Enzyme design. Structure first.
Site, PDB file in Angstrom:
ATOM      1  N   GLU A 202     -13.481 -83.568  27.803  1.00 12.32           N
ATOM      2  CA  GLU A 202     -13.253 -84.662  28.724  1.00 12.32           C
ATOM      3  C   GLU A 202     -14.267 -85.771  28.633  1.00 12.32           C
ATOM      4  O   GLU A 202     -13.899 -86.939  28.807  1.00 12.32           O
ATOM      5  CB  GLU A 202     -13.190 -84.187  30.164  1.00 12.32           C
ATOM      6  N   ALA A 203     -15.510 -85.453  28.323  1.00  7.13           N
ATOM      7  CA  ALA A 203     -16.489 -86.482  28.040  1.00  7.13           C
ATOM      8  C   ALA A 203     -15.985 -87.332  26.857  1.00  7.13           C
ATOM      9  O   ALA A 203     -15.977 -88.555  26.951  1.00  7.13           O
ATOM     10  CB  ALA A 203     -17.810 -85.841  27.676  1.00  7.13           C
TER      11      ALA A 203
END
Lengths: 257, 257
Positions: B172-173
């Site tokens: 997700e980063a």
């Protein structure tokens, strides 16, 4: 007021691009930019000493004319040529008082009865924008016609045709990098040709494009604006993104949210 | 497949930013960018030799684990730790055959019965994302838990909690500069804290944001997407413009018109 000088004599695409770059820089302050497009100063609260810029035009016949542009819309409000200044019919009392500050030193001041909008000017020219040539030769001739209006040598339809030329080549070029691009091509190849539908529909839509962009929901327009392409087909604009390389300056319509 | 190395031992915001910069560069080819956001490779027609990248993680306890990320969505498909490789339940036969190419040299290969999606993993962890800490200490612990799963030292709820940590901090980063920003703050101040609503609603909406952006009419979405802000209030997205500093990578949804 600031003055920008430009001559059609030996004009090149770079001297014309420099000129329109200078006009745009004089017109905008950099204080208000929305979606990367500069907004012109809001008329309410603007001091008269910052209301106008002057563009001084000379041609190969060594004749000069100075147009006064209104900073809030970049449209021409009047002009001087030697002894005389001529102003379009003021839209309201505020603009009537404002123009008293322009060319104060001319002996003879005239204010026309008609206004400077394209509908008026085409009726008077007896021709539409679609049939009036644009280019350096058109602009060269426009400057002599505006000048000789003083000495009675220019008839009114020619005065109006000449205004239609100067407003699209200065005011609309400043409003649209796209229209500026069209003028650069005419000078590159020294062509003279009437404006195609994309030019005219952008000119007609400048006010609505300014409002739709400033009223947009994050760049998305609430209702689409139809424009025309060079070949006359329709094109719907839904978003400010596609207009960013086309419009260069917007008239003030609302405060930035 | 390429391998990117990262250790939680003495991690700084710059070593974490370098790492996510490296992952993103390995994931995208630069061939397809829409509205300034990179699109991930389309799964159909992608050769197996270009399907995955490996991220090798080490912690202060000098334990290592290598996750295999799928290049078309940047999600973790499985991992190895010494002697064993573990893979999530393949979504279809194509992905079942694809994963046979990963960690071929491990002696013991296991494929779990459950899939790697957040709903499954939260049921199994017995906790939601909103209650699982994120940060460098969380990630340090995640690496030991994933490793000791081999030696029977990690119970399943811990294995799932640890997967939830690794997927938000890597996958997700990489998907969102915004979520990457949240992780950098946690490391800057060495805080460990559960994800607020903006993080979780972006994670949940990544697929829909990818489709709405690629299906947009010049950047304007046909219907709005509601997101949540850090304090839980709703926020409507109407246009791709505001998402450009928030999303970093989109899953392929359609050809560029």
């Amino acid at each position: 007021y600031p003055i920008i000088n430009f001559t059609t004599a030996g004009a090149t695409v770079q001297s014309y691009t420099n000129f329109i770059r200078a006009v745009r820089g004089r017109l905008t302050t950099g204080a208000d930019v929305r979606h990367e497009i500069p907004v012109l100063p809001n008329r309410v609260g603007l001091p008269i000493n910052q209301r106008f810029i002057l563009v001084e035009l000379s041609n190969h016949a060594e004749l000069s004319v100075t147009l006064a542009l209104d900073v809030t819309n970049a449209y021409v409000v009047g002009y001087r040529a030697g002894n005389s200044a001529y102003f379009f019919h003021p839209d309201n009392q505020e603009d009537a008082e404002a123009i008293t500050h322009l060319f104060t030193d001319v002996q003879n001041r005239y204010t026309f009865a008609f206004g400077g909008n394209y509908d008026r000017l085409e009726q008077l020219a007896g021709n539409l924008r679609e049939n009036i040539e644009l280019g350096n030769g058109p602009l060269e001739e426009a400057i002599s016609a505006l000048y000789y209006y003083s000495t009675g040598g220019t008839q009114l339809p020619t005065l109006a045709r000449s205004f239609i030329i100067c407003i699209q080549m200065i005011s609309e070029a400043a409003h649209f990098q796209y229209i500026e691009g069209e003028m650069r091509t005419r000078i590159r190849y020294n062509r003279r040709s009437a404006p195609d539908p994309s030019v005219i529909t952008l000119e007609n839509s400048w006010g609505r494009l300014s409002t739709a962009i400033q009223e947009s929901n994050q760049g998305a327009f609430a209702s689409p604006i139809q424009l025309q392409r060079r070949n006359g087909s329709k094109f719907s604009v839904y978003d400010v993104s596609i207009l960013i390389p086309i419009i260069a300056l917007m008239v003030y319509r609302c405060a930035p949210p």
